[PDB]
């Protein structure tokens, strides 16, 4: 695979969003990946509604601001036949009744792919697919107060991931 990849350079990534005091990171990670795939498909980058996911994907297994999984959100989009734009269904940072409206749907999917649990496999996916949804162990003050450079935490775990985020590429420092 290439030495370096940065999908932001190619228009696959929307500006950084803020989930606030709500455990809806799984929804942001999901909209991030969908945003990247829809762009690859249509050439148009449109911000997607995390609120839509927070309020409506309970049947698929998500728990709104109490947590969830990106795969459950992808399953919701597939079951629902769509997902509203961020503009049509603004983020509120708290769970509300489902207000999905098909007229405002700008995205859809036909399932999801779980990447083999190996960094080499993740690299191939990022290189050939685009931004990838992932979960990481962010349960450390070192992550909360991260400032710059390559993040490395000795006490990090590969078993208790608690934060859903988006890998938009990879590279190396000089």
């Amino acid at each position: 695979a290439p030495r370096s990849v940065d999908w932001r350079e190619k228009g696959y990534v929307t500006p950084v969003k803020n989930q606030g005091q709500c455990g809806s990171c799984w929804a942001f990670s999901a909209t991030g990946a969908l945003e990247g795939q829809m762009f690859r498909k249509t050439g148009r980058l449109i911000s997607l509604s995390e609120q839509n996911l927070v309020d409506c994907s309970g049947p698929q297994g998500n728990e709104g601001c109490n947590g969830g999984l990106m795969d459950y959100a992808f399953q919701y989009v597939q079951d629902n036949g769509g997902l509203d734009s961020e503009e049509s269904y603004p983020y509120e940072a708290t769970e509300e009744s489902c207000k999905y409206n098909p007229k405002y749907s700008v995205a859809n999917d036909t399932g999801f792919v779980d990447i083999p649990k190996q960094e080499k496999a993740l690299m191939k996916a990022v290189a050939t697919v685009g931004p990838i949804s992932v979960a990481i162990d962010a349960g450390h003050e070192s992550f909360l107060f991260y400032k710059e450079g390559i993040y490395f935490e000795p006490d990090c775990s590969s078993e208790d991931m608690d934060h859903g985020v988006l890998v938009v590429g990879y590279g190396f420092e000089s």
């Binding site: 390559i150 935490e153 590969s158 590429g169 190396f172």
Partner: protein, 41 residues
């Protein structure tokens, strides 16, 4: 010296414009490759 370019959802003031460089090829650091997926479109 390798890293994964990660986009966070805690606003653009946190980290590097809302992004974080995470250790890559360091024994699946922080489980970054343990729950990775993407939607099929």
């Amino acid at each position: 010296n390798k890293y994964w370019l990660v986009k966070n959802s805690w606003g653009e003031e946190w980290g590097m414009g809302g992004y974080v460089k995470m250790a890559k090829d360091r024994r699946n650091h922080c489980g970054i490759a343990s729950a990775a997926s993407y939607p099929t479109v």
